């Protein structure tokens, strides 16, 4: 084995693994984005500077050349993973921004949500919003399907919403959360979308051309939210067999995507856990928390 | 609910006046709720000042709490309840960075086992 992570000055909110499994990216309240070597001695490669707000969410593009960073300063930055130079920051959004997801296997697209209640589609080449989906309720988490046709948004209305890029309509509503949704994520297959919520329910939803119209495919339990009201994010394993979601009770929860048994409950976080990530090749977990430390658990 | 700020009043009156309020063992907690801090970003100085007294397990600022304008509300977890009592005893009604400071016990937040140890230690002290 276990490697501890030190260096962060404030809460870590998100961390990701580079698509090729050679490096990690992490950021939080301290506005710095740190890069780490996955192997060797787990060294710190560089520091991305330029966010004035806190970093709420990181993502890599599928190639691992571009790193996207939603900040509370209303700007979404695009970063060069190789040099650490800033490329472009999204402009248009109002108030705090909760999340941003970059479309894969298609021409470059970025989706964002913020406290202004809107969801925006960005073409990184235009320096302007492409579409806007005005939502009265503040939006917390947003992701694309694999076809880059649909936008999936989770807010404080307890209802995951699916948007059609061509029709620009509310295509789908999912009921089944009793409280705010704080974190969304697609399976690598496109088949299933994973959600965390203030109702202490982790629920998998299946999105398909042909569906059952009551896609509460599975429900998991263990994951606790509390007074801190931290955004909570969840991740799929590279093969879709394991589900990890962070909690506020200091434990990393990992479940079996089928039987729903808790595979791991991992103590070692003094405070609340904000994001859990899986290494893309090997059974390694990066757990990021508010205690400013990261762990590299191996399964 | 119980966080309301009661008001003061011969009875051989002391130097400082006291509001009418009896403290039971259950009322007292090791969670200390502080309200009235000026909103000038003194998160860390307040916590250091309180850590002078005991040892602080956890501190966070709870923003959901209904507060007045430009004013903050905080939570402090102590390690030993006697330390919490002395922290209240001395910190309450102390001018802090230009504001009156109001500390109250926060028993709602403590969990069942924490209540178990609170009550048991009260019994331990009272027996001796």
């Amino acid at each position: 084995p276990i490697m501890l992570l030190s260096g962060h000055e404030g809460e870590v909110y998100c961390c990701k693994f580079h698509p090729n499994g050679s490096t990690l990216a992490s950021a939080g309240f301290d506005r710095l984005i740190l890069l780490w070597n996955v192997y060797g001695d787990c060294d710190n490669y560089a520091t991305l500077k330029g966010h004035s707000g806190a970093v709420m969410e990181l993502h890599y593009n599928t190639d691992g050349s571009m790193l996207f960073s939603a900040s509370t300063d209303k700007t979404v930055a695009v970063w060069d993973s190789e040099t650490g130079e800033r490329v472009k920051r999204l402009k248009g959004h109002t108030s705090f921004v909760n999340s941003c997801y970059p479309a894969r296997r298609g021409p470059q697209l970025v989706c964002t949500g913020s406290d202004d209640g809107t969801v925006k589609l960005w073409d990184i080449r235009k320096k302007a919003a492409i579409q806007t989906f005005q939502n009265t309720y503040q939006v917390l988490a947003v992701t694309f399907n694999d076809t880059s046709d649909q936008i999936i948004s989770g807010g404080i209305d307890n209802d995951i919403k699916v948007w059609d890029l061509r029709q620009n309509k509310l295509t789908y509503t999912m009921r089944g959360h009793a409280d705010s949704v704080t974190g969304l994520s697609l399976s690598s297959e496109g088949s299933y979308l994973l959600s965390n919520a203030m109702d202490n329910t982790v629920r998998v939803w299946d999105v398909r051309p042909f569906a059952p119209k009551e896609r509460c495919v599975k429900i998991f339990q263990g994951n606790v939210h509390n007074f801190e009201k931290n955004l909570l994010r969840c991740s799929w394993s590279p093969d879709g067999s394991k589900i990890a979601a962070g909690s506020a009770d200091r434990f990393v929860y990992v479940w079996d995507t089928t039987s729903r048994r808790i595979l791991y409950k991992l103590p070692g976080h003094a405070g609340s856990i904000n994001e859990v990530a899986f290494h893309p090749d090997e059974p390694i977990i990066i757990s990021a928390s508010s205690d400013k430390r990261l762990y590299m658990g191996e399964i | 609910s119980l966080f309301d700020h009661h008001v003061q009043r011969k009875y051989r009156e002391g130097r400082r006046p006291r509001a009418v309020k009896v403290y039971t063992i259950n009322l007292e907690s090791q969670y200390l709720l502080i309200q009235g801090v000026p909103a000038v970003g003194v998160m860390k100085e307040l916590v250091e000042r309180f850590a002078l007294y005991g040892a602080i397990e956890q501190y966070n600022a709870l923003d959901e709490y209904p507060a007045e304008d430009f004013t903050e509300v905080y939570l402090i977890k102590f390690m030993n309840l006697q330390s919490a009592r002395t922290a209240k005893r001395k910190m309450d009604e102390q001018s802090f960075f230009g504001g009156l400071l109001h500390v109250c016990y926060a028993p709602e937040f403590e969990t069942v086992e924490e209540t178990r140890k609170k009550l048991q230690m009260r019994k331990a002290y009272v027996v001796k």
């Binding site: 506005r31 806190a54 309720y137 705010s180 009201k229 | 909103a39 970003g41 998160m43």
Partner: peptide, 30 residues
């Protein structure tokens, strides 16, 4: 409905409080 609006307002208040500029890391006094 109405409780959704009140919850949204409360969340907006919480975000406008906890992530205020005055709490930003590296806050120079000057």
């Amino acid at each position: 409905e109405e409780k959704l609006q009140e919850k949204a307002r409360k969340w907006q208040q919480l975000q406008a409080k906890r992530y205020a500029e005055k709490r930003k890391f590296g806050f120079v006094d000057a």
